[PDB]
Amino acid sequence: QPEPDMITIFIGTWNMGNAPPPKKITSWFLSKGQGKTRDDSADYIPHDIYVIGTQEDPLSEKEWLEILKHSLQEITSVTFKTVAIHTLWNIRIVVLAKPEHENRISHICTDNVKTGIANTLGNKGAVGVSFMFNGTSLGFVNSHLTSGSEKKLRRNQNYMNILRFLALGDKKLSPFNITHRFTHLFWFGDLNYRVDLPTWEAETIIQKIKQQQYADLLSHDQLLTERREQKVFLHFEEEEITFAPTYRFERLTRDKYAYTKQKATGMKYNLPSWCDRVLWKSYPLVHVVCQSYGSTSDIMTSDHSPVFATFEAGVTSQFVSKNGPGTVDSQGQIEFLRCYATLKTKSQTKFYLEFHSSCLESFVKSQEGENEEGSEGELVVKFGETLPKLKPIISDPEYLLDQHILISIKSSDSDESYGEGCIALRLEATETQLPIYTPLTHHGELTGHFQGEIKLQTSQ
Ligand SMILES: N[C@H]1CCN(S(=O)(=O)c2ccccc2)C1
């Protein structure tokens, strides 16, 4: 039985509005309704992995897992295995997988982050799940961010707290937050970003939705605008939105948006908005293709509609040679030439690099770089030809060209990371000097750039 080089992943996000679901929710898992929907011909084909994020979920874990497993059984005739379930207050994530994957899945981690302070600590935050699928690391984040049209800055703060403090994936990757720990990271939930148009325009917005004319609404979506200004979700992807706003509906129909201010809303307007979202970030040059992104039309127990997204995702096999694991492959080597970091920092400490990769026995520390002042005020840290030669555990090109090197640039004085990035080994050529580049981030904000040349030697 061959190991796969591709899997499909279903991502669902649903704010349930503290109501039990209806008897049938299969449309969600089939990616049927509005937007980019799944072909009828695929209906019986199970996804490899289903990841279900709920918010305002009133069910026990037992009650929800029964409903989910029943739904998938009815669609696929497959009894899915529970990989992980984790709940913080009424925020929940469930990961289900085909039984044939049970011995492909390992290193399962769960965590949560509670956002805010005092007044604003008690119901918002995130849950997450990570695991290895053969040689591929997968992370999943379900967040319920701060509500309200006038709190986009609070949402951006909630995002930074979640990516700083959610403890998933390989704890040895100590310089790296969740935005660097995974081959594929999916981040979804009730992110609560709103369409920023005047209150008086509510009926105009409703008209536009009835005409399926979303362009003048999406141009005011706070998540799109904050992402374009690099305020949140830097280096993440989102599929184009082609479905109606998923919030705020009258329950038991989808015919009416309930937007007017009420005592129940704290006298706040809820203009129709794309609150419910799926984003992803994969390592450079790894296959990831969104094959659906939409909302259901027939599940109406909540004031939100469910959102689905599905993906093709490249995966690699648990590689064994005669040498690695448990030793290196003399044939293999990674050389860095003419490398330099450009940092936005005002500090003047010396810096060194750490190279982290599951293709190395353990992480590699460089010598300190040579600081120079850049023309336009910047710090340039030069490494020249001084960087260590990295010795991968396996030299087979079918393995090594699929790997990635995480880079952290750390202060000699404090040993704190000033920037993190990732370099793909999926090169155009081996035994050849080739340009490499990554942006550097810290706490998910841009801090600099790393660039230079690489020379990769494989057994071929
Ligand atoms: N124990 C009972 C309670 C819920 N389940 S169920 O399997 O998820 C299910 C849900 C809706 C229709 C048919 C079956 C059966």
Q: What's the structural blueprint in terms of helices and strands?
A:
Elements: E1 6-15, H1 26-29, E2 34-36, E3 49-55, H2 61-76, E4 81-88, E5 91-97, E6 105-114, E7 125-133, E8 136-144, H3 152-165, H4 178-181, E9 184-190, H5 202-210, H6 215-218, H7 222-228, E10 276-282, E11 288-295, E12 307-314, E13 333-343, E14 351-356, E15 364-365, E16 370-373, E17 379-384, H8 397-400, E18 404-411, E19 417-424, E20 434-442, E21 445-457
The structure holds (3S)-1-(phenylsulfonyl)pyrrolidin-3-amine (WNM).
Describe the protein in words.
Belongs to the inositol 1,4,5-trisphosphate 5-phosphatase family. It is found in: Cytoplasm; Cell membrane; Membrane raft; Cytoplasm, Cytoskeleton. This is Phosphatidylinositol 3,4,5-trisphosphate 5-phosphatase 1. The protein is mostly beta strands. It has two domains: 1-325, no CATH class; 326-460, no CATH class. It has helices spanning 26-29, 61-76, 152-165, 178-181, 202-210, 215-218, 222-228, 397-400; strands at 6-15, 34-36, 49-55, 81-88, 91-97, 105-114, 125-133, 136-144, 184-190, 276-282, 288-295, 307-314, 333-343, 351-356, 364-365, 370-373, 379-384, 404-411, 417-424, 434-442, 445-457. Strands 2-11-12-1-3-5-4 form a seven-stranded mixed sheet, with helices on one face. Strands 6-7-8-9-10 form a five-stranded mixed sheet. A hairpin with a 5-residue loop joins strand 16 (370-373) and strand 17 (379-384). It is globular, with a radius of gyration of 23 Å. (3S)-1-(phenylsulfonyl)pyrrolidin-3-amine binds next to helix 2.
